[PDB]
Structure 1
Amino acid sequence: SMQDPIADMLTRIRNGQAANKAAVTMPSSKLKVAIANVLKEEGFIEDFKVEGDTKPELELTLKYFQGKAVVESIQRVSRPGLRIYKRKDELPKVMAGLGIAVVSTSKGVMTDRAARQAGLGGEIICYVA
């Protein structure tokens, strides 16, 4: 079903980015806000808005270069069938340090570049390539 809504979130981003869609909407949650707000601060997307309180609806503004996909590919890493965890020195890089890896720790959701100054490890969410 919708057992991995983060994988459902990454499905809706990769489709609309490739099919030249201007903006998408999706059901919101606390975890989907904490990931899209990081992608807004890392130049991958443009803006996010929330709509509705009894039915929380998250919106994302897409981003293009000259009509080209900014987010070329994104890869869900951990999953409910197999959980993935790393330490503070085993955090993997994406495209040898070009792409970022979204890792949620006890100090909130940050990147692997931001986790070096934080010195923590935890759950890998997605490889933002």
Structure 2
Amino acid sequence: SMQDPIADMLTRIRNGQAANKAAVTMPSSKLKVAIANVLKEEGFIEDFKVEGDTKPELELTLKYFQGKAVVESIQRVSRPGLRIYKRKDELPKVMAGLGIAVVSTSKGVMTDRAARQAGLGGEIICYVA
């Protein structure tokens, strides 16, 4: 009964890309906004905005290249039924470095590459290839 809003956000992206939709809207949370920030900086989504005051709606602008969805694979890793925490030396490399692993560290949400530079581990939120 909606026990994983993060996986819901990833599914909306995955289903929106499969449906070739321009944008996907969803209820907003600061964790979703943090994840959307990482996706935008990595180039997987064009943009996002958080319109709304008391019930904010985060809406992401999906990105298509040559008629194909930019996000080919987007997969939740640390689900509520099974949490995944990785130390710095065992952070995952997605698509041999061509993808990103969104990681929640004590210094914020970043990529696996950014977390490796910062020398931190944390929760593996998702893989984005």
2:94 equivalent in structure 1: 94
In 2, the alpha carbon distance for the partners of 1:67 and 1:107 equals: 37
Q: Aligned residue pairs: how many?
A: 129
Could you list the runs of 4 or more consecutive aligned residues of structure 1 that deviate by over 4 angstroms after TM superposition? none
2:38 equivalent in structure 1: 38
> Aligned-pair distance for 1:52?
1.0
> Aligned-pair distance for 1:118?
0.5
- Structure 2 stretches of 5 or more lacking a match? none
TM-score for both structures, normalised by structure 1: 0.97
In 1, the alpha carbon distance for the partners of 2:37 and 2:95 equals: 22
Q: Which has the higher strand share?
A: 2
Q: Give the SS at the match of 1:114.
A: helix
- Provide the alpha-carbon RMSD of the alignment: 0.8
- Structure 1 stretches of 5 or more lacking a match? none
Q: Give the SS at the match of 2:65.
A: coil
What is the CA deviation profile of residues 69-118 of structure 1, one whole-angstrom value per residue up to 9, with x for unaligned ones?
A: 11011111111111111101000101111101000101111111111220
TM-score for both structures, normalised by structure 2: 0.97
2:58 equivalent in structure 1: 58
Q: Which has the higher helix share?
A: 2
Q: Give the SS at the match of 1:89.
A: helix
